[PDB]
Structure 1
Amino acid sequence: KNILVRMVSEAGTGFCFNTKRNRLREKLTLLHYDPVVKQRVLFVEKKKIRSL
């Protein structure tokens, strides 16, 4: 199944956004727009929010 995860910005900001990834799939690292920084920055998966 899929799990909702909290991608947390690697830019030092507290900005986090939620994505969906397969449980069997590896932890996610993804480029995403940082509104506070106003630039695309890397985000890393921190913790599993739920299992959907």
Structure 2
Amino acid sequence: SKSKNILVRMVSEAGTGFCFNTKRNRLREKLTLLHYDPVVKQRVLFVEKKKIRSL
């Protein structure tokens, strides 16, 4: 029951405060995705901020 992946939180770089949770490999770099922001009604960058839990 080893935990290969962890759940981490991505916040928008647009400053809207929007954020969402996604799973990633522990042995990996911090993620910088391009995700839709409902506040600005378009797609913006999201950077990893905090590790939530291991799964």
TM range (shorter): over 0.9
Unmatched tracts of structure 2, length 5 or more: none
- In the alignment, the residues of structure 1 paired with residue 46 and residue 17 of structure 2 have an alpha-carbon distance, to the nearest angstrom, of 11
- Displacement of 1:7 in angstroms is 0.4
1:16 and 2:19 aligned: yes
- Displacement of 1:38 in angstroms is 0.4
SS in 1 for 2:54: coil
- Displacement of 1:5 in angstroms is 0.4
Partner of 1:3: 6
TM-score after normalising by structure 1: 0.97
The percent of aligned pairs where both chains have the same amino acid is 100
Q: Which has the larger radius of gyration?
A: 2
SS in 2 for 1:26: coil
Unmatched tracts of structure 1, length 5 or more: none
- Displacement of 1:15 in angstroms is 0.4
- In the alignment, the residues of structure 2 paired with residue 13 and residue 5 of structure 1 have an alpha-carbon distance, to the nearest angstrom, of 19
- In the alignment, the residues of structure 1 paired with residue 54 and residue 12 of structure 2 have an alpha-carbon distance, to the nearest angstrom, of 22
Which 4+ runs in 1 deviate beyond 6 A? none
